[PDB]
Design a protein around this ligand. Structure first.
Ligand code: NI
Ligand SMILES: [Zn+2]
Length: 394
């Protein structure tokens, strides 16, 4: 959200909000420089070779999809200057999202969405799940485990394949059992995608793209994501609800109620677990403090005795906010930008962009800069009218 510090990539490490860290992902990875831009939110200006052991190399595979479906450059985001621009780009997009009431609400929900402490085998002990933390190097070279909700990280091999990644549990389905897990969003502010509205060729505002992933992240942080195997005529349920607008109508109402009820019961389990709890692992967190943190997250009701329960009214509000109010469609309305009308894009294009310079893109106007000839008719997003801002890869 509000990012109160303007980071430069070369800013000196301080072990607090600028640090070298390691990701839970097994293997002895080299520590990477990361920046804490807000409570619970970090940015790692590196290509993601870390979250998936089968995706550790950036070269195009022999059978790669071609532009504009995929795009490959093993050297993208390999230099200090690129990483600085990436950090600054990602930060600007957070400000753009935060500048809307809707984005302010979403970013708040995200910060509150601490992944549940369901790490213990003793059903009376509260314990953090290791894969919801990062290890932060300290001055003496020791590591300090820090909980976090969200990491923005550079893309893996396919530069334009953005998505939410998270570490799984051996038995728990964290993004689908109400628990939640730290979300790693593969994202780049340095490219964007085209759509058609000889029809004009427009570019998606990167803030909409990022907001889209943040919506996925919200579902996944509250453990209410829909299994990708659930689709409607086909596109996944999870994508249709996230995109919103016209295409949401293809979601089966009954199926929608099934999941609302399902996740209702999942929240109830969480409340019972909290009630049961007697021990807690760690240091700066009292069990009372954590119970309160999760009361806050799941909007639980608490009686005089201190017992937790789920309020169906509060639950309905929260669920609707996360699944119906936070949509790409609704963000487009708040940004007042042009966006493709339907989830599936049959006229794709890919462009290199640079959002960082003020002459190019602003927190308040994106590409459609007020008091320029780019202000009207979404001229700023028109790849032919605003051609200096969009370099077509193919
Ligand atoms: Ni229709
Ligand atoms: Zn999506």
């Amino acid at each position: 959200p509000f990012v109160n510090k303007q980071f430069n990539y070369k800013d000196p490490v301080n072990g607090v909000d600028i640090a070298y860290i390691k990701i839970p992902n097994a293997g002895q990875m080299q520590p990477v420089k990361a920046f804490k831009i807000h409570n619970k939110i970090w940015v790692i200006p590196e290509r993601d070779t870390f979250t998936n052991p089968e995706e550790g190399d950036l070269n195009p595979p022999p059978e790669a999809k071609q532009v504009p479906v995929s795009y490959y450059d093993s050297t993208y985001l390999s230099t200090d200057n690129e990483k600085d621009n990436y950090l600054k780009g990602v930060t600007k997009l957070f400000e753009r999202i935060y500048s809307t009431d809707l984005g302010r609400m979403l970013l708040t929900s995200i910060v509150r969405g601490i992944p549940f402490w369901g790490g213990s085998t003793i059903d009376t002990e509260l314990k953090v799940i290791d894969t919801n933390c990062i290890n932060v190097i300290q001055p003496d070279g020791s590591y300090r485990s820090e909980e976090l909700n969200l990491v923005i990280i550079g893309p893996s091999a396919d530069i334009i394949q953005f998505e939410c990644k998270s570490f799984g549990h051996e038995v728990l389905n964290l993004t689908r059992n109400g628990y939640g897990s730290t979300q790693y969003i593969r994202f780049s502010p340095d490219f964007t995608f085209g759509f058609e509205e000889g029809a004009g060729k427009f570019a998606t505002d990167p803030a909409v793209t990022l907001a889209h992933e943040l919506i996925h992240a919200g579902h996944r942080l509250y453990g209410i994501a829909i299994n990708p195997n659930r689709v409607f005529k086909e596109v996944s349920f999870e994508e249709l609800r996230t995109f919103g607008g016209h295409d949401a109508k293809f979601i089966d109402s009954l199926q929608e109620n099934e999941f609302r009820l399902y996740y209702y019961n999942k929240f109830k389990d969480i409340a019972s677990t909290l009630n049961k709890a007697k021990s807690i692992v760690g240091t700066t967190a009292s069990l009372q403090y954590m119970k309160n943190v999760f009361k806050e997250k799941y909007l639980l009701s608490e009686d005089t005795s201190g017992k937790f329960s789920v309020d169906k009214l509060k639950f309905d509000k929260l669920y609707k906010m996360l699944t119906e109010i936070y949509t790409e469609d609704n963000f487009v309305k708040f940004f007042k930008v042009l966006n493709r009308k339907t989830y599936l894009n049959f006229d794709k294009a890919v462009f290199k962009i640079n959002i960082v310079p003020k002459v190019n893109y602003t927190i308040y106007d994106g590409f459609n800069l007020r008091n320029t000839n780019l202000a009207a008719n979404f001229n700023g997003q028109n790849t032919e009218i605003n051609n200096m801002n969009f370099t077509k890869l193919k």
